[model samples]
Target: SLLITSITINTSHLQGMLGFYRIIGFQFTASKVSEVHRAVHNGVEFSLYSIQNPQRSQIPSLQLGFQITDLEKTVQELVKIPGAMCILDPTDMPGKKAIVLDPDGHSIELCEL
Candidate 1:
């Protein structure tokens, strides 16, 4: 059997992205070898690597989903963060769900648990 263990993101806004994820409940630790901050949640490793000249970066084509306790409250708080934006509010989406964009424009789907 195989497991999807980790996801590494190349980002220019390391602190902002890390803060966004921290609000999503990921606890991070700095890497000793490189300019990397890593967080593990439910056995899945999420890594953010620092980058330069991100204006030339490609559009993020993938989406990330999370099961949250309160969709409205969480999405509201997230959008207030510097690098986060609300794409779809909880009221607009069916089943207590919402869509938000991360610092680097990664789509994040939130659903009430």
Candidate 2:
């Protein structure tokens, strides 16, 4: 048996980053003023860490992806968020997928399975 775990991301703008994720449905479970925060939306979770003091610049290109039960419904919900960037409006692509760029510039893919 295998259980998928959460994803961790590093960012200099911790508060703003977490706020952005909050709108996307991730609820923070832990936080520290100048360190890190943990959040989960449904069963999927992710962590954000400070990039202020990092070993080297960052990891390779970052992208967070998730599959939703209903693509159009979720897309409408996502667009209501103030800072959301609609890279590719929700359209039928293989599995009714959409690409959105989060406030932090990471590509988030929302797909239907």
Candidate 3:
């Protein structure tokens, strides 16, 4: 079976990054850098890292796709978050429907296909 092992995000502040992850439902497994290193070595490898002033790569920004069963309700809830912006209000993409962005300038492509 295939499984996602980890997703690393480089940020300027560890606490702020962790706060965002916590809000998004990712549980914290380790806090200490050394412990995380050991966990990786032992195969308990899944974590998001936060570093100060990480080198910005040319990699394209990650667009998070979420399947929202109710587009209207989802958009309403998302808009309540501070700093949320809409790239496109509930629009059709192929055979499915989607809403473009959410809080913190994150692109959320909601679909039902």
Provide TM-scores for the models. Answer: 0.88, 0.65, 0.49
Residues 3-70, candidate 1, lDDT per residue (tens digit)? 99999988888878988888888898996754799898888899999988556777689899998786
Worst 10 residues of 2 by lDDT: 51-60
What lDDT score belongs to each candidate, Candidate 1 first?
A: 0.84, 0.71, 0.51
Clashing pairs in 3: none
- Candidate with top lDDT is 1
Q: Can you write out model 3's per-residue Cα lDDT over 1-113, one digit (the tens) per residue?
A: 97666555444444544444343334666654212311232233435554445365343377776554667566665555554555677767664665554333456576665
Better of 1 and 3 by TM-score: 1
Instruction: Count clashing residue pairs per candidate.
Output: 0, 0, 0
lDDT of 2 at 43: 69
lDDT of 1 at 80: 76
* Tens-place lDDT digits, model 2, residues 1-113: 87667778777667667766775567777754347788765565688887774546443388878776767776676666555667888887758888977656678888888
TM-score of 3: 0.49
For candidate 2, what is the TM-score?
0.65
Error (Å) of candidate 3 at residue 60 is 6.7
RMSD (CA, Å), candidate 1 to true, equals: 1.7
